[PDB]
Amino acid sequence: GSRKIIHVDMDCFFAAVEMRDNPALRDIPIAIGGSRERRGVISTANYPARKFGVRSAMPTGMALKLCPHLTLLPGRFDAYKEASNHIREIFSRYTSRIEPLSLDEAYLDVTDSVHCHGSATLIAQEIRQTIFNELQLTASAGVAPVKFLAKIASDMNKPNGQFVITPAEVPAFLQTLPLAKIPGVGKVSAAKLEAMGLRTCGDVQKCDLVMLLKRFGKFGRILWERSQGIDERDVNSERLRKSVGVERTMAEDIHHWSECEAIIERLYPELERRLAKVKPDLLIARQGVKLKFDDFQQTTQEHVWPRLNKADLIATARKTWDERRGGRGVRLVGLHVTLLDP
DNA sequence: CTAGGGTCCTAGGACCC
DNA sequence: GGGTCCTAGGACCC
């Protein structure tokens, strides 16, 4: 009863799209991200920029200190969505069992596939080659019996490569696998695990599930399972979007309600346009606002509401401004909607 | 020097039975 | 004295 799971993941996605569409950028360091003057961060960088240490989520000021010649690009999201739709269509030539996780990646369950004599290795290779042939972008892939191992494997031979983990190989692979490599084990969890002597899956294997449950709750069961190669999560294919948000960080902090209200007036039309694409009648479950202060604390306040309404979002932002700000400057204003459940 | 797009989990009181 | 809704926060993912 062993499944075959592929994880396909585009290489340096946004940057690879920009280098294809403008070959002038192929061999200089580039990154998509907000300017230093906009208090931006890097969305991603090409390999010439990564060589200097430039990474996703890095503050753009730090990126530019590491790489003074970095070319900063704003981003063309319709171009990325176009490439995304294309690779998902390519995935569909092989199976309907597709769970996209983001624009540039997806799980595929090819257990019941007849392509390539049932070879998940050869299916992954064909998909990667077809994506290069049709989009002139490269992808990496991982092949494993369960989701999380397939996703880890897709990183091990990138760019433009793949890695296969068989059941026979799972114990040796897990023994030294750092817990931080597990999707969902982030910096905070890894530091808590490290402070109790747990670094790798091999370490967690020597642990009592009951202690893990007590110390981490439901997350402790996940850690226990994953550390043994256990991951029964099915490839879904029917997941739907549950929210839409629109937020902006200002170049300077704001200190006056008039400035906040002015920012909302620009955010609202964008929220309405994006909601309408998926809910033409604007009917929703909740709406709300987000403020982020200069001490980086953030607050949200949202409430049951039947239909997108600008004045109520202003009114709510006014309350939040008056009630939870405590005289701090504000660096971000955001609007938010929770979608009806079907 | 710290984005913008999201998902998921936790947790207290409200409301219900 | 349990189940679910409402709400806020926060880790985490891309």
Ligand SMILES: Cc1cn([C@H]2C[C@H](O)[C@@H](COP(=O)(O)OP(=O)(O)OP(=O)(O)O)O2)c(=O)[nH]c1=O
């Ligand atoms: C991680 C990350 C990605 N993104 C965007 C830009 C990425 O190109 C796109 C897909 O993310 P990833 O697949 O995580 O990264 P990548 O494609 O740029 O590089 P890699 O070859 O290592 O896979 O999502 C962000 O905007 N912010 C982020 O923090």
Ligand SMILES: [Mg+2]
């Ligand atoms: Mg990628």
Ligand SMILES: [Mg+2]
């Ligand atoms: Mg990806």
